[PDB]
Chains A and B, each alone.
Chain A
Amino acid sequence: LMLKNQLLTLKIKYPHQLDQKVLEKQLPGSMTIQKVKGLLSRLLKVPVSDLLLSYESPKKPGREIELENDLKSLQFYSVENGDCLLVRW
C-alpha cells in the first residue's frame, strides 16, 4: 500500500563468479522480468541477451526453476519474500 508492502527482498547469487559476495536487494513484486534483466545488465555490465535468471525458494532446497518468459512478473512465478536469485551468463 505504501510501495513497501510489494517489494520482495531477494538475495542475488553468482555461481559462475564465486569471488563476489552476497547482495540482498528489494525489488518490486510487479516488476517484469525484462526490467530485472535490464537492471542486472546495467549493473554487471553484461548484455541482456546473455543472461539467465532463476528463482529458488528456501522451502524447496535444491530446486531451480528457470525464468524463460520475459513479459511475466515475479509474482506470476510464485516468488515469495526471501527467495534466492541465481544469474548465469
Chain B
Amino acid sequence: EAFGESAETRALLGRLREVHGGGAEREVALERFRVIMDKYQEQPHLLDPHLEWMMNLLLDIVQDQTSPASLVHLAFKFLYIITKVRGYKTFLRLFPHEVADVEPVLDLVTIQNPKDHEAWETRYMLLLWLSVTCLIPFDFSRLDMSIMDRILQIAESYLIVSDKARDAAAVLVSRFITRPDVKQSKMAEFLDWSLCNLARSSFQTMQGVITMDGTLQALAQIFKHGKREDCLPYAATVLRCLDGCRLPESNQTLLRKLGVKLVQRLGLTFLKPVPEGVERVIEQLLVGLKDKDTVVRWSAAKGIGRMAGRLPRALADDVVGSVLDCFSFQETDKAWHGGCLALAELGRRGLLLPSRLVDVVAVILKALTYDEKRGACSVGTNVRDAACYVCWAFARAYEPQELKPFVTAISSALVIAAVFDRDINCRRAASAAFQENVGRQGTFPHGIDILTTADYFAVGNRSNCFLVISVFIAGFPEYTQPMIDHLVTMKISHWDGVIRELAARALHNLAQQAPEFSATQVFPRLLSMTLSPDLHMRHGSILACAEVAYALYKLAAQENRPVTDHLDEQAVQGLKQIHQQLYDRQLYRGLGGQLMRQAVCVLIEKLSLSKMPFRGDTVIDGWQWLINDTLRHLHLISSHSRQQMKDAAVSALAALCSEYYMKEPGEADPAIQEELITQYLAELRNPEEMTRCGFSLALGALPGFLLKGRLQQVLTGLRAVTHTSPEDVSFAESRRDGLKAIARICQTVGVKAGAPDEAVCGENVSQIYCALLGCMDDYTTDSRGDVGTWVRKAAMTSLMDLTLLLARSQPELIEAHTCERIMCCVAQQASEKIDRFRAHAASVFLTLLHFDSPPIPHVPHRGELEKLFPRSDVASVNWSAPSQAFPRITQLLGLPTYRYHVLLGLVVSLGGLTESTIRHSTQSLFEYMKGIQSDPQALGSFSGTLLQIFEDNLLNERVSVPLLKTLDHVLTHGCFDIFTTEEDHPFAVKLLALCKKEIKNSKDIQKLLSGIAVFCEMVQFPGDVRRQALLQLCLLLCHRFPLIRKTTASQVYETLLTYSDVVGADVLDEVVTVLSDTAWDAELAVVREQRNRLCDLLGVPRP
C-alpha cells in the first residue's frame, strides 16, 4: 500500500485561499480533508515520505504578512489534524528550529484568545512549535520583557486551562526549563509556583482539579526530561508536598495516575543510574497497585519495574516478595492483576531471582484460569491476559536451565488457555506467549506442531478450537489427560449453556483418542457429580455422561463390540438412576427443572442409540412417563426454548421406540403399541395447542414397524385434527404440526402396493392429497396478525415431500388433476408479496420442476416452464428480492393454465401495503403487458380472467381492495386504449356493475377511495358507461364523510383536466368554475345546490 491521495491532497491544500471566504465550502473541505487523512490512522507511517512537502504548504501561508485570520485558522486546523493523525513527537522535528523562528512564533502566540472555543487549535500546535524552536544551541541573552519571562508566563497560563492546550503548555514547560541557561535562572520560581498551586487547589472544585492535573503533568514532564544532579535537591520538598495532597484518597483517576507517575519519577531520580525516601515511594506504589482503574495499576507496575531496575538485589527481592504478597485468597481481582503486571514488568528486564521460581510459578497456575462468578457474568479476563503477558515475559526473564522443571506446568498451562477459554484476546495472548517461548527456549513438546495448527487466524474461531485444534493438540500423550481433567473440572461447571455444550462436544471428540482414560477415570467422577445441588453442574454432568457413552458405543461399534465392553456394572447401574434420582428430588420442577428436562432427554436418545441392556425394566417406563410429562406440559415453558425442547423430546421418543420397543425383527409388542397410540390420539383433541402440537410431532416421529396394522387410524386422526373447526379457528400451529407429522409419516412409511393399513398406497394417497389441498387454503387472521401463513409454508414442504416419494416409487399413483392443482397452488404462493414465503415457494417450484429421477408426471407446460426457468439461473436468482422475483414470475401469466391462480396471487402484491413491492409489481406488470398490448385477444382474455377473479372474490376484503387498486393503476397507465374506441364495451360494463355493488353502502374510506378512483378512471370509455360513472360519482359526492366528498371532488377535477372530450367547450369552463368555487367539506345543505347545478350542467340525472 502507498499514499494514493497524493495529487488529491496536494490540490486540496492548494485550494485554500478560495475556500475560507464562505462557510459551507469551508466545512465541506474540512470534512473531505478529515475523511482523507483518517484512512491512515492505523498505518500512519505511509505518510512519512509525503509529510515533508505537505507541511511546507501549510506553514508558508501562516508566515505570510498578507493572510487573513480565517486562512491562518484553517491552516492551523489542518496542521493539528495532520499532527493528531501522524504524531507530534514524530512531526515536530520537521518544523523550523533556527534562532530566527523564536520571536515570530512566541509573539504570534500572544495574538490568540484563551476564551475562543472556535479558533482553539491555533492555541495548541503553537506551544509545541515554541518548544521545538527552544532546542537551538544559542542563548537568549544574545537575542534580547525578555523571551524567557514571556515563555514562563504563557506556560503558567495554559497549564491552568481545561482545553487541549494544557498538554502543549506542559510540553513547552518541560522543554524550556530543562535548558542550560534556563536551569540556573527560571526553575525554583516555577517549582514554588507549582507547590503553591498544589497546596491551593482541591479535588471538589472543577477549576482546582484542572489546575492540579496541569501542575502534576508539568512536574512529571520536568522530572522525566530533567537532570538527575539538579532535580534531586528539590525532589525532597516536592515529595513532601505531594504526600499531603491526599491523591490516593481522591475520586479522580487522572489525578492518581499523574501522582503515581510523579512519585515513580522522583524515586528514579533519587537513585543512581539506599537513600531516604525510597521506602516511602515503594510503599505508596504497593498501596496504589490495588486500584480499580486499569491505567493506574499499569502505571504503578511500570514504576515498580523501573525502580527495581536500578535498586540493589535485596531491595529487588523485597519488592518481589511484596508483590507476591498481593495474591492471597482474601485479596481481590484488582490486586491479582496489579501483581501480575508488576511481575511482568520485573521479568521484562530480568530482575527476578531463581529462588522465587518455586512460588511465582504456582501463582501462574491459579492466574491463567481465574474464574469467579460474580452474579450474572464472571470476572477474570484481565487476570488471564496479565497471566499470559507474564508467561510471555518469562521467555526472556529466566533461562531454560532454570525453567526446565516448569516446562510441563507452563507448556500445558499455555495449551489449555489458548484452546479452552471464552475470550478471543486471552487465547491470542496465550498463543503469542507460547510462540515466543518456543522461539526463545524451544523446550516445549511439539512446539512447531502446535504453532502450525493453532495459528493467529485459526485461534480466532472458538468453535474450531474445541474440535479440530483441540483433538490435534491432544493427539500427543502430553495433552491427553490434562485436557480432559480441565474440561471436567472447569469448562463443564460453567454458567453458560453454550460453553457447556462446546465442552461436551470437545470431550466427545477427544474421547476417541483415549478410550481407556475416558472410561475408567473420567466416567466415575462425572457419574457421581450428577447429584450436586447446583443445576448447571448437574446439567454439565448429564451432558458429559451422555457424550462419553455415545463415544464408547461408537468405539465398540468399530470392533463389532458393545458399549458395556468399556462401561462396568457400576456405570450402567448409576446411568439408570439419573431420571429416578431427579424425579425423587423433584429436580424437573421449576424453571431450573426445565434444564434437567433438556438434560435427561439427551440422555434418553444417546442411551437409545447404544442398545443398552434396559429392555424389560422400570427405567424404560420412567423415561416414557418423563417424556409424556414434558410433551404434555409444554405451555408452561418460555416461547424461546419451546421448539428446541420439543424437538429433543420428539427425537428421544423416536429413538426409544426404535430401540427398546421391538419384540421381534419387524414387529413390536401389541400391548405397548395399543397403549401408546390410544393416548397419543386421544390427546390430539386436547384444548391446549402446545400439547396438541407435541403429541402430533410425537406421532409423526414414530417408526414404520410400529405403525403396522394401525396406520389408517393415525392417518384419520391427523386428518380430523387438522381442520378449521368453529371452536379452534386460531389454531395455526396445531395444523402446521399436524401437516408436518403427516409428511414425516408419508416419508418414513414409503410406498407399498396392497397395504393401506401399513404403508401408503392407492387407497389412502387420494385422502392424503385431499387433506393437503384443503389445508393449503388458509388465510386466517387475528390480533397477532396473518399467522395463517405459518401453516401455508408447512403445506408446501409437504406437497413436495410426497411428490418426490411416489415419483421414485410407483409414479402412476400421481394423478393429473392433483398435480395440476398442486402446481397452481405453488404458483399462487410464489406470486405472494412476502419475501421469505415467496422464496420458499420459488425454491419448491424449482425443485419440483428440476427433478429428473424420474421426472414427476403431468406438469402443465413443462417445456415452457423449463425455458422460462433455466437451470443455471437458480442460485443466482434472489427470489427474496422483489426486483429479482417479480419480473421473473410475472411471465407465467402468458400460459393459459398459469393465468388464473398466478393473476390471483399477483393481485395482492400489485394492490398491497408496501411501497417497494407495489412499485416492483407494477413495473413487472407493465413490462409484461407491453408485449401483449396489440393483439386484442390477449387483452380480452386478461380482462375476462380479471373479471372472473373479481367476481369469485367479492366482499373478501382480503382481495377486493387490492384488485381495485390494481385496476386503478392499470387504468392510470392506460392498458385498455383499444377498448375505448367502441361504445358500451363488455369489460367496461361488467366492471362498472361489479364495482358499484362492491363499495355499495361502504363505511371503509379504504375501499371507498379505490372505488372513487376506479369510477373516475373509467370515464374514458364513452357511451352509457361514462353516464353511469358520472351518475354514481354525483350520487356518492353527498356522502356523510367530508373527506370522501373532498377526495371525490379532487378526483373529478383531475379526471376532467386529463380527458378533454368528457365535457364540451362552453360547458367545461363553467363546470371548472363551479368546482373551484365550492366547499366540498362544509354543510351539505349548501353543497346540495352545487351538486344539483353540476348535474344539470353535465346532464347527470337529478335523483
Residue A30 is within 8 A (CB to CB) of chain B in the complex: yes
Residue B878 is within 8 A (CB to CB) of chain A in the complex: no
Contact-residue bracket for chain A: 20 to 34
CB distance from A69 to the nearest CB of B (A): 8
A48 and B926 CA atoms in complex are apart in Å by: 10
Is the Cβ of A1 less than 8 Å from the Cβ of B1081? yes
CB distance from A45 to the nearest CB of B (A): 11
Is the Cβ of A39 less than 8 Å from the Cβ of B930? no
CB distance from B732 to the nearest CB of A (A): 33
Residue B615 is within 8 A (CB to CB) of chain A in the complex: no
A61 and B918 CA atoms in complex are apart in Å by: 35
A3 and B1046 CA atoms in complex are apart in Å by: 8
Is the Cβ of B919 less than 8 Å from the Cβ of A3? no
Residue B1058 is within 8 A (CB to CB) of chain A in the complex: yes
Is the Cβ of B1077 less than 8 Å from the Cβ of A4? yes
A2 and B1053 CA atoms in complex are apart in Å by: 12
CB distance from B1072 to the nearest CB of A (A): 10
Residues of A within 8 A of B974 (CB): 38, 41-42, 48
Residue A86 is within 8 A (CB to CB) of chain B in the complex: no
Where chain B touches its partner, the secondary structure class is: helix
Residues of A within 8 A of B973 (CB): 38, 48
Residue A34 is within 8 A (CB to CB) of chain B in the complex: yes
A35 and B973 CA atoms in complex are apart in Å by: 9
Residues of B within 8 A of A38 (CB): 972-974, 1058
Residue A49 is within 8 A (CB to CB) of chain B in the complex: yes
Partner of B1076, one of A3, A41, A70: A3
Residues of B within 8 A of A35 (CB): 972, 1054, 1058
> Provided the pairs A4-B1077, A70-B919 are in contact, do residues A28 and B1059 lie with their beta carbons within 8 angstroms?
no
Residue B1057 is within 8 A (CB to CB) of chain A in the complex: yes
Partner of A3, one of B918, B969, B1053, B1058: B1053
Residue B392 is within 8 A (CB to CB) of chain A in the complex: no
Residues of B within 8 A of A6 (CB): 1050
Residue A18 is within 8 A (CB to CB) of chain B in the complex: no
A85 and B1081 CA atoms in complex are apart in Å by: 30
Is the Cβ of A42 less than 8 Å from the Cβ of B1059? yes
A28 and B1080 CA atoms in complex are apart in Å by: 15
CB distance from A29 to the nearest CB of B (A): 9
Is the Cβ of A39 less than 8 Å from the Cβ of B1057? yes
Q: Which residue of A is nearest B1020, CB measured?
A: A42
CB distance from B160 to the nearest CB of A (A): 50
A34 and B1053 CA atoms in complex are apart in Å by: 16
Residues of B within 8 A of A71 (CB): 915, 918-919
Is the Cβ of A2 less than 8 Å from the Cβ of B919? no
**Beta-carbon contacts under 8 Å, A40-76 to B:** 41-42, 48-49, 69-71
Partner of B1050, one of A1, A3, A39: A3
> Provided the pairs A38-B972, A71-B918, A71-B919 are in contact, do residues A31 and B1054 lie with their beta carbons within 8 angstroms?
yes
Residues of A within 8 A of B1049 (CB): 3
Residue B1079 is within 8 A (CB to CB) of chain A in the complex: yes
Task: Scan B945-979; emit 1 where CB is below 8 A from any A CB, else 0.
Answer: 00000000000000000000000010011100000
Residues of B within 8 A of A70 (CB): 919
**Beta-carbon contacts under 8 Å, B1045-1096 to A:** 1046, 1049-1050, 1053-1054, 1057-1059, 1075-1081
Is the Cβ of A2 less than 8 Å from the Cβ of B1054? no
Task: Scan B50-80; emit 1 where CB is below 8 A from any A CB, else 0.
Answer: 0000000000000000000000000000000
CB distance from B1046 to the nearest CB of A (A): 8
A25 and B1072 CA atoms in complex are apart in Å by: 13
CB distance from A81 to the nearest CB of B (A): 15
Residues of A within 8 A of B930 (CB): 49
Is the Cβ of A34 less than 8 Å from the Cβ of B972? yes
Is the Cβ of A49 less than 8 Å from the Cβ of B919? no
CB distance from B922 to the nearest CB of A (A): 8
Is the Cβ of B1050 less than 8 Å from the Cβ of A2? no
Residues of B within 8 A of A30 (CB): 1050
CB distance from A10 to the nearest CB of B (A): 13
Residues of A within 8 A of B969 (CB): 34
CB distance from A8 to the nearest CB of B (A): 13
Partner of B1053, one of A25, A28, A49, A69: A28
A41 and B1076 CA atoms in complex are apart in Å by: 25
Task: Scan B699-724; emit 1 where CB is below 8 A from any A CB, else 0.
Answer: 00000000000000000000000000
**Cβ contacts A to B, 23 pairs, < 8 Å:** A1-B1079, A2-B1077, A2-B1079, A3-B1050, A3-B1053, A3-B1076, A3-B1078, A28-B1053, A28-B1054, A30-B1050, A31-B1054, A38-B972, A38-B1058, A39-B1057, A39-B1058, A41-B974, A42-B974, A48-B974, A49-B926, A69-B915, A69-B919, A71-B918, A71-B919
Interface residues in chain A, defined as those with a beta carbon under 8 Å from any beta carbon in chain B: 1-4, 6-7, 25, 27-28, 30-31, 34-35, 38-39, 41-42, 48-49, 69-71
Interface residues in chain B, defined as those with a beta carbon under 8 Å from any beta carbon in chain A: 915, 918-919, 926, 930, 969, 972-974, 1046, 1049-1050, 1053-1054, 1057-1059, 1075-1081
Ranked 8 nearest A-B pairs via Cβ: A4-B1076, A39-B1058, A38-B972, A3-B1049, A28-B1050, A34-B972, A48-B973, A2-B1079
